[PDB]
Structures are given as C-alpha cells and as structure tokens.
Structure 1
C-alpha cells in the first residue's frame, strides 16, 4: 500500500535498524545490549514498531517491545507501546521535520508501580537512528536510562 499522507513525513523511519545501546540508572550498574527495530506500515495513518534486544556476546534474547506511532500533520504524534516486561506506555509529543527528530513524554505508564514517567527522544544523525529513553521513579527525577544508535539495514 502507498504511504499514508500522515506517515510520509516519517518515512525515513520505515525499514529495519540494528545497532547497540547502553543502560545505566542510579540504582543500576551500566549494561550494554544489541538492538533491532523495525518500522512498517499498511497504508493507514500508523507506523507499526517492533523492537528486540539481546546480549552482545552471545545473541541471547533480552527484552522486546512493540506498538504503534500515530503522527499528524500539525507535527503532533502519539505512540503506544507494550513491553515484554509487562508495562505499557502512552507517549505524546511532537516530531520535527527539519531536525528529523521525535520527542515524546508519557501521559501514562501502566502496570509499573515504581516507574512514574518515561520519555523517549529519537533523532536521525547522519542517517543513523539515535534515541535516548529517560525514566523517573517515585524517588528519582526524570533522567537518562537508555541510549542507543542503530544503522539502517
């Protein structure tokens, strides 16, 4: 199907991406992971998102998440994500065509009592997809949790 007009400004996402990331948080010693993301569509004003992570040495699976990105022509966007850990997120924010960036903050995090907010920010940098995930908890204000850079396949 053709790309819906509302998806076309984010057409640079469409495809599969692979790279690696790092996590760290005040309670949690640093760790690294491999990551794959696929963005796809079926002609609707929605981009399907699917993601998985693995251990770098072995390729052993770690976690997975999936959901849907819903951009609108005013530059607004909402994103819904379900995670293999048992959390859900409703993310809302904006995308910027000139910067090839997407900036999201949670309206809601479901099923995760200690986690309060999650933000997710993407940027295309020299054709690579970079992001930062930030997380707050009851006692820790919003701050970096995950960062990754992925090459387009």
Structure 2
C-alpha cells in the first residue's frame, strides 16, 4: 500500500513510537507513565492511530486509545478518538509541514460531563514525537495535563 497523497505530508508519523510522559493538573497530583503509539495506514486518505500507556515502574496497563487522523491538502485535519475510559473526542485543527507540527482543539468531548475542552498538539522535535495534551473542566480553564516525548522504533 503506497501512502495516499492526502496522508503523504504526515508520513513521518507512520510506525511505532515509544517513550514516556508526565501528567499534572490542578486536581491530579503529578505522575509518570510509559506510552506507545502506532500510526498505520492501508493506502486510504486516513491514518489509524492506536495508543497505550502503562505504569512506568510496574509496566501495568493504564489507558488505551484508538482513532483516525484525517488530513486534507489545505493543511486542515480532523481526528476522532475513542478511549478505553469511555470517552470519545472529535479533534480539529491544522498541520504545518514546515514545523512538522499538528495543532488540534476538541470540537467535541463525549461521555465526559466534567471535561470541557481537550487540545492536543504534536511536534517532531529532533526526530522524536512530542505532544502536549491540554484539558479544561467545568471548573478549571484550559491548561497542560500531559506532556510526552517518544522515540520511533
């Protein structure tokens, strides 16, 4: 399967990333986690995304997500994600081929009444995949929650 021309600008994502991150939020005291993310494709104008996080010290599973990245040649992109916690997300924004970055704001957060906005920003930095996830809640404004850096395998 060749990479679809719609997906070609993001082909640096494709493969298996592994690394580690940190969470902290006003409500949640800080923590570290292992993370693995696989981007794959089947020759269509879509990238499939799957992800898992585990306890850094125990290797005991925490969360999983899966979804689909849908980029379009005008630089816009939508991402739909389902989480093992029972949450769904519609994410929208842009990608920049120069910066090899992707900036997303939730258009919808579903099945999580307390969580308002979620943004996710990816960025290839030094050949490693980085992201910041931000969360806003009923009571707390939008602010970082998760930061990670992963090596491509």
- The bucket for the TM-score relative to the shorter chain is over 0.9
Q: How does 1:67-86 map to 2 (within 5 A)?
A: 67-86=67-86
Q: Distance in 1 between matches of 2:10 and 2:113?
A: 33
Deviation by residue 1:37-90 (Cα, 9 ceiling, x = unmatched): 000000100000000000111211111000000000000000000000000000
Deviation by residue 1:84-116 (Cα, 9 ceiling, x = unmatched): 000000000000000000000000000000000
Q: Distance in 1 between matches of 2:149 and 2:126?
A: 11
Structure 1, gaps ≥5 residues long: none
Q: How does 1:40-119 map to 2 (within 5 A)?
A: 40-119=40-119
Q: Distance in 2 between matches of 1:2 and 1:125?
A: 26
TM-score w.r.t. structure 1 length? 0.99
Deviation by residue 1:22-42 (Cα, 9 ceiling, x = unmatched): 000001100100000000000
Cα root mean square deviation, aligned: 0.4
Structure 2, gaps ≥5 residues long: none
User: What does residue 144 of structure 1 align with?
Assistant: 144
Report the Cα offset of residue 149 of structure 1: 0.3
SS in structure 2 at match of 1:25:
coil
Q: Distance in 2 between matches of 1:104 and 1:2?
A: 26
Q: How many residues align?
A: 153
**Runs of 4+ with deviation above 6 angstroms:** none
TM-score w.r.t. structure 2 length? 0.99
User: What does residue 2 of structure 2 align with?
Assistant: 2
